[PDB]
Amino acid sequence: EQVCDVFDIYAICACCKVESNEVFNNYTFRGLGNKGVLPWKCISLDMKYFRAVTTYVNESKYEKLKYKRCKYLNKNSKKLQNVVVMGRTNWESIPKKFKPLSNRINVILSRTLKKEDFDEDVYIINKVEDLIVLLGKLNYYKCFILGGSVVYQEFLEKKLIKKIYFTRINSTYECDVFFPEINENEYQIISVSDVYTSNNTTLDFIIYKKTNNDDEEEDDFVYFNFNKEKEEKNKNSIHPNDFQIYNSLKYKYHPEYQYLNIIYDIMMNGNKQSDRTGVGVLSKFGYIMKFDLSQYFPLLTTKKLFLRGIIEELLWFIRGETNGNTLLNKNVRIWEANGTREFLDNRKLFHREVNDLGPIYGFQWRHFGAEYTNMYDNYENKGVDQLKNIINLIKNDPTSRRILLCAWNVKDLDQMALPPCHILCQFYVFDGKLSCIMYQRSCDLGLGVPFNIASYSIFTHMIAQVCNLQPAQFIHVLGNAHVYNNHIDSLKIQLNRIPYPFPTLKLNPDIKNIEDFTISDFTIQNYVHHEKISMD
C-alpha cells in the first residue's frame, strides 16, 4: 500500500528540447528552467492546462478518498481544493500578483525560509515527510508537485509520484535545469493528448503512470451487443501480445492515432485479397481522417519521413509537368518505375517515350480536356486550368460547393502511366479559413498514405496562402484501404511506438501566386521522430 496512492501525489511539469542524423527518445523533452525562470516566454495553452489539472476537484469522489486516507492512518470547512507543492525557487519565479495560486492550498519547501519570511497564506515545510504529515491532517482532493528540478528529483527517488502530467514543448530553448530521466521500468506513458499550437510552438500533454512491475443502462449495452462475432477466434492471424504498448494506452488522442488506428482496424478486420501485383493485402473500404493544419503539420512521428521528394512532386504537378526526367534530375525517384520501356509497353503505351508519363496529375490540373501529345508540348490555353479556376472560386465565391480539382479524367486514364490515386480535392471556406477534402480510391497504408497526408497538407497550406486565407482542416477520405502482407511486421513495430508532438510547416510568406513556390520556400521545424522503418 504505497504512500502516493493514498495521498494521491502527482507531478505536473512541462519540458522543452535542449541544445544537444539526430536520435530521439523520451529524454528529448527534459529542459525545465533557465536562470531561475522558465525557458520560454508564455505558452498560455500550457498555463490553461496547468490551471485545469491543479484546480479540478470532484466532491463525489472525495468521500472514497477520505475513507481511504483515514483507513491507512488507523482512524473544518468542506470547500474542496487541491494541494500544490513548490520548491522555494519555483515559488520566487511566480509573479507577486498570482501568489498564492488561487483556489489551491499552497505548500512551499525551504530550509533558508520559515513561515515568518512569508506574508501569503502558504504552508512552509522543512522536509518531504512534512508534506505526508500535513496531507494526513488536511481535507484536499489531489496533491500536485509543481516542481523545481530539485523537488522533482527527491519526489521520484522516494517513489512518491503516482503519475506525471508531463507537457512536451516541441521547441528548443536555453536551459540550466532539467527534469530527471524517467526510468521506463518505473513509469510507462498511458495517455497522449491532442497536439496544439500556442505562442508559435506545438505541444501535447502526456501522462506517465507508476508501473506495477442509474446502472440499469450498464446492462442494456450487453443485451444490445448479443450478435457480436468476435469471441476472438482471431478474424485475422495478428496477435494481442504483439501490440502490448498500443493496446495498453487508455487515451490515444494524438492525431497520428487516426492513421495508426486504421492500420490496427485493417490488420484486425481486413479482408484478405490478391491485388494487381499478386502481393496480397488486407483491405477495407471507406475511412475519414481529419488533421487540424492550424494546430500542426501531420508528418507521422512513429517513423522518419523525408519530404524533399514529395514537395518537388507537388511543384512538378503545379507547373503542369508530365516529364519524369525532371524529377529524376532532382534525384526524385517517385515516378521512375512507372516510366520504364517495360512498364509503358505493359500498359500498351508502345508509342510513349521512356519517362513520358502521359496526361497525369499535372496535365489534368492545368489542361483537363486537351488532347495529350507528348511531355514536351506547349499546352498553353488548351483545356481547363482547374487549378487557376479553384483559386478564383476561393477568392471570389468562397461559399461555392463546386471548388473541386479532379485528376480522374476518364478519357485519358488508359493513356496515363497509371490512373491517379488522388481522385479529387474539394475546398470549403468559412471565416477566412480554408479546409480541403482529398478522396483517394487506392491507399497503401504502410508506404503511400503517410506521404499522401503530407502532400495534400502542404498543398492546402499553399492554396490557403495564395488566397490570403489561414489553413484549417485537411480531410483525407480513403476508399480502398489496404495493408500489403509484407508490410505487416514493420507496421507491428510502428504501432507499438508512441507519437511525438507533430512538427510545424513554414512557407516563405512572400509567395502570392500558386506558380511561384520553389523547394527553398518550405521548412519543417521541430520534426521529432522514431528512426526509419524499411516497410518490407
Ligand X SMILES: NC(=O)C1=CN([C@@H]2O[C@H](COP(=O)(O)OP(=O)(O)OC[C@H]3O[C@@H](n4cnc5c(N)ncnc54)[C@H](OP(=O)(O)O)[C@@H]3O)[C@@H](O)[C@H]2O)C=CC1
**Hey, which residues are catalytic here?**
421
Q: Are strands 470-484 and 433-444 parallel, antiparallel or unpaired?
A: parallel
Query: Is 364 known to sit in a ligand binding site?
Result: no
As measured in angstroms, the least distance from the Cβ of 399 to ligand UMP is 9
CB 182, CB 164: distance < 8 Å: yes
**Site for ligand UMP contains 402 (CB under 6 A):** yes
**Site for ligand UMP contains 421 (CB under 6 A):** yes
Candidates 17-25, 30-38, 409-417, 514-522: pick the segment binding a second copy (CB under 8 A).
409-417
Residues 6+ apart with CB under 8 A from 304: 529, 530, 531, 532
CA proximity to 502, closest of 141, 266, 258: 258
Q: What angle do CA 277, 278, 282 make, to 5 degrees?
A: 105
Q: Residue 152 or 459: which CB sits closer to ligand E9X?
A: 152
As measured in angstroms, the least distance from the Cβ of 179 to ligand E9X is 10
Residues 6+ apart with CB under 8 A from 248: 188, 190
Task: Kindly identify the residues of this chain, within the stretch 50-79, that bind ligand E9X according to CB under 6 A.
Answer: 50
Q: What angle do CA 144, 147, 149 make, to 5 degrees?
A: 150
Q: Residue 145 or 421: which CB sits closer to ligand UMP?
A: 421
CB 126, CB 151: distance < 8 Å: no
CB 149, CB 179: distance < 8 Å: yes
Residue written as grid cell 519517362: 355
Compute the Cα dihedral for 451, 452, 455, 458 and give only its sign. Answer: negative
Strand arrangement, sheet containing 433-444: 271-273, 281-292, 470-484, 433-444, 422-430, 404-406
CA proximity to 194, closest of 167, 164, 232: 167
Query: Is 111 known to sit in a ligand binding site?
Result: yes
Fill in the per-residue mask, 179 to 218: x = in contact with a second copy (CB under 8 A), - = not in contact: -----------xx-xx-x--------x-x-------xxxx
Task: Kindly identify the residues of this chain, within the stretch 473-492, that bind a second copy according to CB under 8 A.
Answer: 473, 475, 477, 479-480, 482
In the list 4, 15, 16, 38, the residue contacting ligand E9X (rule: CB under 6 A) is 38
**Site for a second copy contains 237 (CB under 8 A):** no
Amino acid identity of 367? H
Query: Is 149 known to sit in a ligand binding site?
Result: yes
Query: Is 371 known to sit in a ligand binding site?
Result: no
Candidates 201-209, 335-343, 445-453, 457-465: pick the segment binding ligand UMP (CB under 6 A).
445-453
As measured in angstroms, the least distance from the Cβ of 499 to ligand E9X is 19
Q: How far apart are CA 257 and CA 246, in angstroms?
A: 10
Q: How far apart are CA 92 and CA 102, in angstroms?
A: 16
Residue by residue, DSSP assigns 444-461 as ETTTHHHHHHHHHHHHHH
| 156, three cell numbers | 521520484
Buried b / exposed e along 406-442 (16+ C-beta atoms within 10 A):
bbbbeebeebbbebbbbbbbbbbbeeeebbbbbbbeb
Candidates 223-231, 318-326, 436-444, 487-495: pick the segment binding ligand UMP (CB under 6 A).
436-444
**452, interface contact from ligand UMP, ligand X, a second copy, none, CB < 5-8 Å by kind:** ligand UMP
Q: Residue 71 or 402: which CB sits closer to ligand UMP?
A: 402
In the list 145, 327, 443, 491, the residue contacting ligand UMP (rule: CB under 6 A) is 443
Candidates 55-63, 72-80, 205-213, 417-425: pick the segment binding ligand UMP (CB under 6 A).
417-425
As measured in angstroms, the least distance from the Cβ of 382 to ligand UMP is 26
CB 339, CB 355: distance < 8 Å: yes
**477, interface contact from ligand UMP, a second copy, ligand E9X, none, CB < 5-8 Å by kind:** a second copy
**246, interface contact from ligand E9X, ligand X, ligand UMP, none, CB < 5-8 Å by kind:** none
Query: Is 385 known to sit in a ligand binding site?
Result: no
Length of the chain: 536
Q: How many CB atoms lie within 10 A of CB 295?
A: 21
**443, interface contact from ligand UMP, ligand X, ligand E9X, none, CB < 5-8 Å by kind:** ligand UMP
Peptide bond into 100 cis (omega under 30): yes
Q: Which helix (H) or strand (E) holds 16?
A: strand 9-17
Candidates 23-31, 52-60, 314-322, 352-360: pick the segment binding a second copy (CB under 8 A).
52-60
As measured in angstroms, the least distance from the Cβ of 485 to ligand UMP is 12
Q: Residue 86 or 249: which CB sits closer to a second copy?
A: 249
Query: Is 440 known to sit in a ligand binding site?
Result: yes
CA proximity to 103, closest of 62, 72, 140: 140
Catalog residues that contact ligand X under the rule CB under 6 A. 13-14, 32-33, 36-38, 87-90, 93, 109-113, 126-128, 146-151, 154, 177
Fill in the per-residue mask, 164 to 183: x = in contact with a second copy (CB under 8 A), - = not in contact: -x------------------
| 525, three cell numbers | 521545424
Residues 6+ apart with CB under 8 A from 398: 429
**46, interface contact from ligand UMP, ligand E9X, a second copy, none, CB < 5-8 Å by kind:** ligand E9X
CA proximity to 134, closest of 1, 286, 9, 313: 9
Binding-site members are 14, 32, 34, 36-37, 88-90, 110-112, 127, 148-151, 154, 276, 401-402, 421-422, 440-442, 444, 452, 482, 484
Binding-site members for dUMP are 276, 401-402, 421-422, 440-442, 444, 452, 482, 484
Binding site for ligand E9X (CB under 6 A): 12-14, 37-38, 46-47, 49-50, 90, 93-95, 98, 101, 146-147, 167
